Write a protein that binds this ligand. Structure first.
Ligand SMILES: *Cc1cc2c(cc1C)nc1c(=O)[nH]c(=O)nc-1n2C[C@H](O)[C@H](O)[C@H](O)COP(=O)(O)OP(=O)(O)OC[C@H]1O[C@@H](n2cnc3c(N)ncnc32)[C@H](O)[C@@H]1O
Ligand SMILES: O=C(O)c1ccccn1
Length: 394
């Protein structure tokens, strides 16, 4: 049984960022990853992730401002620009309400927070970005500060920095049991056992598998989402991230999005996807890894009709797992398990969120809680929510 100050369960971006921060602070940290580092079987896949500035949720705007300096520090340390301002384009029917929100409502929130944007008409959208055949009443905005994030560059940086700082990184090892006590946590994996001062759970959609035996269950839902990669057919002029807000059809939500071009890449491929209603998985093992045929056909057909800048026959289709609070009013689960079980403060939990954009911040917060039990950042609205009735003594 090896002993560490902190054991991180999960070697995705949040786990690696936490380990880098813990090790740089001079504590002994071990990261246990069930598959391989850089795997694309959890919530981290593809080459890119979006970082918009526009939100109707005040807390997301605040987190965005607090994370930016942390991205800059990371970029400096690894000698790589990781965030690229390519723009965030939201267009279509400006009043339809979707899981992404509503154009008009969001534009009012930008007006209020003093976030700049340009309002565009269908003809401007087709001219500037290459879309074709849009209904002439479609409108929307371009928030120029919207960015795209180099996912592979970020993972490489975090892995290398964590390793250089002394973190012990082990792959192909699955954590199967956690038992906190007053003096630390006992960790069992399919390869051995460990003793930790505290454990950070950054295991994507698997958090409940380790909390269940301890009498806790968090209120999050897991979704397998389809994504398709397409070859760029015509050279880009402006290729921002885009989301098409439309009225639903009787069979689907009729929503589609594209991540935009990847500046660090040769400009050969881009990725897009449908944003259709998807029922939650009962457990992550239910994921198949095969993108839903009908959704891929709908997306490819829409791109054939409306965005001829890309060859609409996908080069590759795949899936990614989203892990989100079941309550749409909540954005993230980041905190300890202090209110969920005895000695719960010894388990630091990153349990749900649409969060690649906050990876440097979340890693710092998890490191703070792992070695101090407190962070200077406000995480009051991110408290992990129990899926069970409260019957325990507090
Ligand atoms: C799927 C998805 C997510 C997404 C997105 C689009 C799609 C299709 N677009 C985003 C965007 O534009 N902007 C953004 O900020 N986020 C966006 N997301 C979400 C983002 O990708 C996720 O928030 C992020 O990937 C989460 O990272 P995290 O590090 O939390 O999790 P992970 O990569 O799933 O890694 C967890 C690791 O844990 C390992 N694991 C699991 N169980 C165990 C056990 N028992 N023992 C050891 N290791 C374990 C996994 O193997 C994994 O590597
Ligand atoms: O606004 C976002 O963050 C978003 C939406 C759909 C797909 C990817 N990113």
């Amino acid at each position: 049984t090896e002993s560490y100050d902190v054991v991180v369960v999960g070697g995705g971006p949040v786990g690696l960022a936490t380990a880098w921060q813990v090790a740089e602070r001079g504590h002994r940290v071990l990261v246990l990853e069930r598959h391989t580092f850089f795997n694309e079987n959890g919530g981290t896949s593809g080459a890119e992730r979006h970082w918009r500035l526009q939100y109707t949720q005040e807390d997301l705007f605040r987190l965005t401002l607090e994370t930016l300096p942390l991205w800059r520090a990371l970029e400096s340390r690894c000698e790589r620009r990781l965030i690229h301002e390519i723009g965030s384009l939201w267009f279509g029917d400006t009043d339809v309400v979707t899981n992404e929100g509503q154009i008009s409502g969001t534009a009012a929130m930008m007006d209020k927070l003093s976030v700049r944007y340009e309002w565009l008409k269908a003809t401007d959208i087709e001219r500037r970005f290459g879309f074709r055949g849009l209904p002439r009443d479609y409108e929307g905005f371009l928030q120029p500060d919207g960015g795209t994030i180099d996912v592979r560059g970020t993972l490489a940086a975090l892995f290398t920095l964590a390793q250089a700082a002394g973190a012990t990184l082990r792959a192909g090892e699955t954590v199967t049991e956690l038992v906190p006590d007053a003096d630390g946590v006992s960790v069992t994996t399919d390869r051995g056992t460990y003793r930790a001062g505290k454990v950070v759970l950054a295991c994507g959609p698997y958090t409940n598998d380790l909390l269940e035996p301890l009498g806790a269950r968090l209120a999050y839902s897991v979704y397998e989402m389809a994504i398709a990669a397409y070859r760029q057919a015509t050279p880009v002029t402006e290729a921002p991230f885009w989301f098409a807000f439309q009225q639903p059809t009787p069979q689907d939500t009729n929503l589609f999005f594209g991540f935009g071009h990847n500046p660090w890449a040769p400009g050969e491929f881009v990725r897009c996807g449908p944003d259709f209603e998807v029922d939650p998985l009962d457990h992550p093992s239910a994921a198949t890894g095969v993108a839903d045929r009908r959704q891929m056909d709908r997306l490819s057909g829409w791109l054939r009709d409306h965005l001829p800048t890309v060859d609409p026959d996908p080069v590759r289709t795949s899936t990614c797992l989203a892990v989100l609070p079941t309550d749409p009013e909540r954005q993230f689960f980041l905190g300890t398990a202090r209110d969920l079980m005895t000695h719960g403060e010894k388990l630091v939990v990153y349990g749900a969120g649409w969060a690649f954009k906050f990876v440097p911040l979340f890693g710092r917060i998890c490191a703070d809680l792992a070695v101090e039990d407190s962070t200077a950042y406000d995480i009051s609205r991110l408290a992990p929510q129990s899926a069970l009735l409260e019957h325990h003594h507090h």
